[PDB]
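Help! Submission page says 'invalid entity' but I think these are all valid:
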Amino acid sequence: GTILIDLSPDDKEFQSVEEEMQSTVREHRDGGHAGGIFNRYNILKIQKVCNKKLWERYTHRRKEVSEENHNHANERMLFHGSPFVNAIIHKGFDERHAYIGGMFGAGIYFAENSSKSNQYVYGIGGGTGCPVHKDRSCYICHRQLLFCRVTLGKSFLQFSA
Amino acid sequence: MAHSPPGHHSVTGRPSVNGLALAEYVIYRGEQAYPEYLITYQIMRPE
Ligand SMILES: O=c1cc(-c2ccc([N+](=O)[O-])cc2)oc2ccccc12
Ligand SMILES: [Zn+2]
């Protein structure tokens, strides 16, 4: 039930997603090891993901959280990078997209920094880099990230290195 | 998949050393996210 609609680079919606992508790049403490060495991206395509069933699943749960948190879903737009992006867009997030060894337990992780999610595109720690060249810092191969609508509700605050 | 801490719907990882890092978040139910945009890109070699 998923269809992908291409956005024109002229569309203000394309532009505001691109801007969030570019403006949230930072330097990482691994010096580029996991995600590569870069200060910005070349954006090749942005597509809107439409799946009625997955959308209503999302909104049904959003309402539940909202009613548990003084009518405040605490919804954000956040980045997610994963080897499983194609399963995610067709079947939704589930158990199988969790980070079992993440510092905040086994759950599904999202970032405000696009460059942080970029570190997971080829796997945890960048895996072995791109399929074609085995290069975590590959400048040739096409990468994909998700920009996602996320319900946080009442969020537990963990201070941390 | 683990559970949220009792009485919470998610975890926020707040950076407490790297002054430039933004926050990271964790949810424990798939239904709390919708994958709205697919962005295809390349990283660019600095000059
Ligand atoms: O975008 C993210 C994807 C992932 C991630 C982690 C593990 C898997 N996995 O188990 O294959 C997938 C994506 O982890 C993050 C951690 C911190 C911030 C953002 C992310
Ligand atoms: Zn490559």
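Support: the input was valid. A stray whitespace character was the problem, and the output above is from the cleaned input. Chain B has one domain: 1-47.
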